[PDB]
Amino acid sequence: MKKLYIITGPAGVGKSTTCKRLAAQLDNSAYIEGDIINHMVVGGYRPPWESDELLALTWKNITDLTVNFLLAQNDVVLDYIAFPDEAEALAQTVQAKVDDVEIRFIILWTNREELLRRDALRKKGERCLELVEEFESKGIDERYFYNTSHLQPTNLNDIVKNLKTNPRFIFC
């Protein structure tokens, strides 16, 4: 069967690093970077938080690409910002267009202070907390969170090995 991995979480949490490693581990997979999709719009571009229209478009494009990759016998690894609402919506569509698809929802988390330093090497802040409090207030189940503040990057393959089979993320 096919598998969909919705890896989300605050900026600097290591979504990109985790998704790239995960994708490279499956025999047949597709890696979708939400940001590249969103930034495809040039003329008239506006950030996600300033246009529900442009944001819905981005999820439309993500969804259609995900369906095609799954139908094509590819596992899909999605890296983007996603809350219960978006995950639910995506799931409804794929499930209605593809059979035997086990979807996994995974929210990578570390520590407020960790994200504080993790970005101190981007191109030079407080904003790294804006997304943090959003996930919390959304009252998301605790089984979808994966705190890696105590793990080592040298164990990256174990982490991706876990979230690949761990049933807790199976999107109960």
Place this chain on the structure above:
Amino acid sequence: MKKLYIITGPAGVGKSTTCKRLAAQLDNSAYIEGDIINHMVVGGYRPPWESDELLALTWKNITDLTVNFLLAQNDVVLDYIAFPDEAEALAQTVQAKVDDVEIRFIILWTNREELLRRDALRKKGERCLELVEEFESKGIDERYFYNTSHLQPTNLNDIVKNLKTNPRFIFC
């Protein structure tokens, strides 16, 4: 109305540079880079010339993204390798899913020797000619070709200004 710009041609001809400038000129537009789409497949990846399946997938993804952007009131600028067959197919789908869409087919060309030097600064060849003879043998109409071997890069805005309104590319 909406407009679709299918900019193709051999590697090093300046498709990326031309498309990015064109997109940035329209009020509402989307820029699609065929290569980023194609490279979304990780596990089991294979070059376009080694899998008609993976290649068809890439065009499927490109097509679905193009339709969504056009319906969303965005002009679409596509940068990829495309022959009459692919252009025709894409056109049939968009035209069947969107109204008032003027599609333009544009093949950027320069000179055999030009492409010879244009790539001598990639990361260090003959292969730059493989795509050249392909376009020629395909017996493509001469109205779609746009030779810029005699133009100057300092006239980039004029070039994109031309192919934006010039009717010769209107895909007769």
